[PDB]
Amino acid sequence: MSDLFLELNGKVHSLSETFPGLSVQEVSRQSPQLSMETAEIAGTDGVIPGMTQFKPFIFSAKCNLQALDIPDYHLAVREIYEFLFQRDSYYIWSDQMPGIRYEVHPKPVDFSRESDRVGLLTIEFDVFKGYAESRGTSLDPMTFEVDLWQMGMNLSNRDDLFYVFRENTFRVYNAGSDRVNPLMRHELDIAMTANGTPTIHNLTTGESFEYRKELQKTDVLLLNNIYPLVNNRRVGKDTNHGIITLEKGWNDFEIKGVTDVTIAFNFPFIYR
Amino acid sequence: AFEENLYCDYTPGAAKAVAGKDVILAVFNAAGDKLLAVAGQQGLTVNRSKDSIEIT
């Protein structure tokens, strides 16, 4: 059995459950739209590729609606149109792969009336970020009872994966298919509490974030995307304005200038 | 038709068949007041069909 789940206004709605007469036949996903920024020099052969990018793509769901009678059919069509089309983008996922969700916007799709009570539909959701992300962030535990993780999410079956560290040198595993960069509108949060003047170094990437003031254990330093704060107060003037990024796989992190470090990473995995 | 129906089962329970000559087609005239059976009928066929929609 196939079904489609929609996250809207903080509520999860099953498409089949919401509309009893509507059942999802099949789901499908367009392949990533790779595009190399070609540059052509006249007289030479081929192109000089720039930086490969990914265009928005389409997630499709073929379904059918079976109503009791004609007024019921029209009412169901209107209610489905009301439910699907909202002002802002929402989230969708499928039973087949319940660990991966897409932030999407609906597309105009017309009901194909086959009989007096049945109508075929092929809903298409445009995903504009160009990638899919996990339903849960890195802060969620990798436990069975959380009911969030599934197979095929590049989870390493060779070592434990935790995202809270108590020492000055450790490794963090980004399981996504893209390098997590807040400059690319990626979600990434770091919460560190320690004593002294801190400096975070990502050795594999080679990046370094530097804060130039003394810190106490009671003050939390929070880097969200491209904003560093202490106690939710912007302190960008007192930093080196550097930002760390998470490469694919393992990243070696070293923290200098502080003691009793407690650093936590909170970011979703980027799939495609 | 007797002897306790030992060998002749005369009890009517079902027709078990209908002679084709018994079923005929008639039409209503232009005024619609009288039904008229078409003269000299010899073969009648009624076809009823329903479409199928694939929801695989």
Residues 6+ apart with CB under 8 A from A240: A208, A209, A210, A212
DSSP conformational letter for B28: E
CB contact under 8 A, A115 and B56: no
**Residue in chain A nearest B56 by alpha carbon:** A25
A201 Cβ partners below 8 Å, 6+ apart? A207, A208, A253, A254, A255, A256
Q: Which of A213, A252, A256, A218 shows the shortest CA–CA distance to A235?
A: A213
Q: Which two tokens stand for residue A154?
A: 């590049």
Expressed in Å, this structure's resolution amounts to: 2.9
Q: Which of left, alpha, beta for B3 (phi over 0: left; psi -120 to 50: alpha)? A: left
Structure token digits, residue A63:
């379904």
- Cα(A133)–Cα(A116) distance, integer angstroms: 40
Nearest chain A residue to B51, by CA: A115
Q: Which helix (H) or strand (E) holds B36?
A: strand B35-37
| Residues linked to residue A264 through DSSP beta bridges, in sequence order | A164, A191
Decide if A120 and B53 are in contact by the 8 Å CB cutoff.
yes
From chain B, the residues in CB contact with A116 under 8 A are none
B20: which residues sit within 8 A by CB, 6+ positions away?
B44
Collapsing DSSP to helix, strand or coil, B20 comes out as helix
